[PDB]
Design an enzyme around this catalytic site. Sequence first.
Site, PDB file in Angstrom:
ATOM      1  N   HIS A  61       0.811  -1.209   0.000  1.00  0.00           N
ATOM      2  CA  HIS A  61       0.000   0.000   0.000  1.00  0.00           C
ATOM      3  C   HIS A  61       0.858   1.279   0.000  1.00  0.00           C
ATOM      4  O   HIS A  61       0.467   2.213  -0.686  1.00  0.00           O
ATOM      5  CB  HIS A  61      -1.134   0.052   1.081  1.00  0.00           C
ATOM      6  N   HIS A  91       5.880   6.787   6.643  1.00  0.00           N
ATOM      7  CA  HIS A  91       5.450   6.521   5.294  1.00  0.00           C
ATOM      8  C   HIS A  91       4.788   7.742   4.719  1.00  0.00           C
ATOM      9  O   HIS A  91       4.585   8.727   5.444  1.00  0.00           O
ATOM     10  CB  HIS A  91       4.499   5.309   5.279  1.00  0.00           C
ATOM     11  N   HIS A  93       1.539   9.116   1.851  1.00  0.00           N
ATOM     12  CA  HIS A  93       0.396   8.944   0.997  1.00  0.00           C
ATOM     13  C   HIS A  93       0.544   9.975  -0.109  1.00  0.00           C
ATOM     14  O   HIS A  93       0.890  11.113   0.163  1.00  0.00           O
ATOM     15  CB  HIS A  93      -0.908   9.177   1.752  1.00  0.00           C
ATOM     16  N   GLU A 103      -4.181  13.067   2.741  1.00  0.00           N
ATOM     17  CA  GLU A 103      -5.322  12.465   3.445  1.00  0.00           C
ATOM     18  C   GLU A 103      -6.091  13.566   4.163  1.00  0.00           C
ATOM     19  O   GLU A 103      -7.248  13.838   3.910  1.00  0.00           O
ATOM     20  CB  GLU A 103      -4.860  11.375   4.355  1.00  0.00           C
ATOM     21  N   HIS A 116       3.518  10.662   7.224  1.00  0.00           N
ATOM     22  CA  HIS A 116       3.069  10.184   8.504  1.00  0.00           C
ATOM     23  C   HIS A 116       4.230   9.581   9.259  1.00  0.00           C
ATOM     24  O   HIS A 116       4.769   8.533   8.869  1.00  0.00           O
ATOM     25  CB  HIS A 116       2.000   9.104   8.345  1.00  0.00           C
ATOM     26  N   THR A 195      -5.619   5.383   9.150  1.00  0.00           N
ATOM     27  CA  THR A 195      -6.327   5.661   7.921  1.00  0.00           C
ATOM     28  C   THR A 195      -6.347   4.514   6.949  1.00  0.00           C
ATOM     29  O   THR A 195      -6.869   4.636   5.847  1.00  0.00           O
ATOM     30  CB  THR A 195      -5.861   6.932   7.214  1.00  0.00           C
ATOM     31  N   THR A 196      -5.771   3.357   7.355  1.00  0.00           N
ATOM     32  CA  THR A 196      -5.832   2.136   6.608  1.00  0.00           C
ATOM     33  C   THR A 196      -6.446   1.060   7.484  1.00  0.00           C
ATOM     34  O   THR A 196      -6.315   1.127   8.707  1.00  0.00           O
ATOM     35  CB  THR A 196      -4.393   1.669   6.206  1.00  0.00           C
TER      36      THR A 196
HETATM   37 CO   LIG Z   1      -0.607   6.949   6.960  1.00  0.00          CO
END
Ligand SMILES: [Co+2]
EC number: 4.2.1.1
Length: 257
Positions: A61, A91, A93, A103, A116, A195-196
């Site tokens: 992801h 990580h 996004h 996000e 993040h 958020t995942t």
């Molecule tokens: Co994140």
Amino acid sequence: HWGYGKHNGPEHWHKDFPIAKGERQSPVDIDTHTAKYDPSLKPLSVSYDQATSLRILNNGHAFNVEFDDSQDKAVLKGGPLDGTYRLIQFHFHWGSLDGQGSEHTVDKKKYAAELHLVHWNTKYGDFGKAVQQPDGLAVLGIFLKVGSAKPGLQKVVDVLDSIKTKGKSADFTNFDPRGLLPESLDYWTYPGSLTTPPLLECVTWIVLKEPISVSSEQVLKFRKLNFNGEGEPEELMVDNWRPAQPLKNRQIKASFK
Ligand SMILES: [Co+2]
């Protein structure tokens, strides 16, 4: 399994993870005019001098830069936080285009990406136990806009060829996350979630107001990663962001006027 496609994306996650429709889901839109200054917050203390990065992994992801979290080496404290939170990984996004990827949003504005830095509360002993608590994690979120290059990102970008596909890792020692921070630590904070999937409601979010700048070339290299494993059909790792969720009964606080 879950992902970011039409058939397995955010709109579907609630079937396996009903907490997707819960009371404190993330991300959210940050309405800057409605956030309130909270004079009793702290300055943030970000203490990353002794950080020990270990590895970078494409998990299908995103990619995670992982740290040694077996001692208080890279810790977050202060602000809204009670106690000591240890850095486990960071990580990003990001989007397929520079106009989306973050996000969190700020007055509905989407940034090109969001970093993040994930930390867990040492009172709970390990990450896995922390995610089961309402104050288990603290995630420091930092927006990315496209403009000048971020020098401290370059070492991350240049290893990405070696972890193109899901399940690939590479050694990633001696990386200093301080080089990913903006000048100011002014922030917004609110209680939310991962958020995942599994979308656990365990996160104190701390979202910095000041974005960092990265270059077009840097973000383009993010977009060359793959969601798929080696030997599978190529699907570019882009648009790995969950959209804003309802704020519900929460107030976003600001550390600054
Ligand atoms: Co994140």
